[PDB]
Amino acid sequence: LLCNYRKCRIKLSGYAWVTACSHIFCDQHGSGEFSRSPAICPACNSTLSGKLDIVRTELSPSEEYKAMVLAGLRPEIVLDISSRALAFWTYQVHQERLYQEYNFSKAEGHLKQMEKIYTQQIQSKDVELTSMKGEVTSMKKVLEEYKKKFSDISEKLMERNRQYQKLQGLYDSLRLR
C-alpha cells in the first residue's frame, strides 16, 4: 500500500491510519491529520467524525491477534468482514492504477506539446534560411551586372587612352614643326 496523501505516497509498513472513506495514510501524516478535532481526509476531503471512521491499524499483525480477532464470530460475519477488507484493497489497487495511467497520459501530453513547439520552430527556422538565401541570390545578381558595367567602363577607358595617345602624337608632331 501507499500513503493516500498526495505529497507522500510512501509504502506503508507498521502503523497506518485507515478511514471509513476507503483511504489509508502513513503514521506521520495520519497522526498529524487525524488527531485534530476537525478531521478532514486529505484525499477526498470527506468529513469524518465517528470513532470507528478512523483506525490506527498495524499492517503486519501478530499471529495471536490474527488467531483471536475474529474468533467466536459466525462464518457469515467473518465472510462479510473479509469481503469489506478485500473491497478496500481492490479500491486502493484501482486508485494506484488510475494514478499511473494519469501520469502516463501527462507524459504523452508533454511529449506532443514539445513536438508542437519544436515543429513550430522548425518551420520558422526554414523560412529565415530561405529568405536569406533569396536575398543572397538577388544581391549576387546585382554584383554580376555591376561587374559587367565595370568591363564596359574599362574598355571605354582604354579606348579613350588610345585616342588620347593618338592626339599626343599629332600634337607632338605639329609642335616639332
On the CB side of 53, how many CA atoms lie within 13 Å of its CA? 12
Rounded Cα gap, residues 161 and 39, in angstroms: 108
Name residues contacting Zn ion, limited to 17-36 (CB under 5 A).
19, 21, 23, 26, 29
Name residues contacting a second copy, limited to 135-174 (CB under 8 A).
135-136, 139-140, 142-143, 146-147, 149-150, 153-154, 156-157, 160-161, 163-164, 167-168, 170-171, 174
Q: What is the 3-state secondary structure (H, E, C) of 11-29?
A: ECCCEEEEECCCEEECHHH
The residue (of 7 and 142) whose beta carbon lies closer to a second copy is 142
The residue (of 40 and 97) whose beta carbon lies closer to a second copy is 97
Strand 15-19's sheet: what is its strand order?
Answer: 23-25, 15-19, 54-58
Other CB atoms closer than 10 Å to residue 39's CB: what's the count?
Answer: 16
Name residues contacting a second copy, limited to 60-119 (CB under 8 A).
60-62, 64-90, 93, 96-97, 100-101, 103-104, 107-108, 110-111, 114-115, 118
Q: Nearest approach, Cβ of 43 to a second copy (angstroms)?
A: 14
Q: Nearest approach, Cβ of 70 to a second copy (angstroms)?
A: 4
Handedness of CA 72, 75, 76, 79 (dihedral sign): positive
| CA proximity to 55, closest of 69, 86, 34, 37 | 34
The residue (of 40 and 143) whose beta carbon lies closer to a second copy is 143
Residue 26 three-state SS: coil
Q: Which residue has the cell 473491497?
A: 87
Name residues contacting a second copy, limited to 1-60 (CB under 8 A).
1, 12, 16, 18, 20, 22, 24, 50-53, 55, 57, 59-60
170 binds, among Zn ion, a second copy, none (CB under 5 to 8 A by kind): a second copy
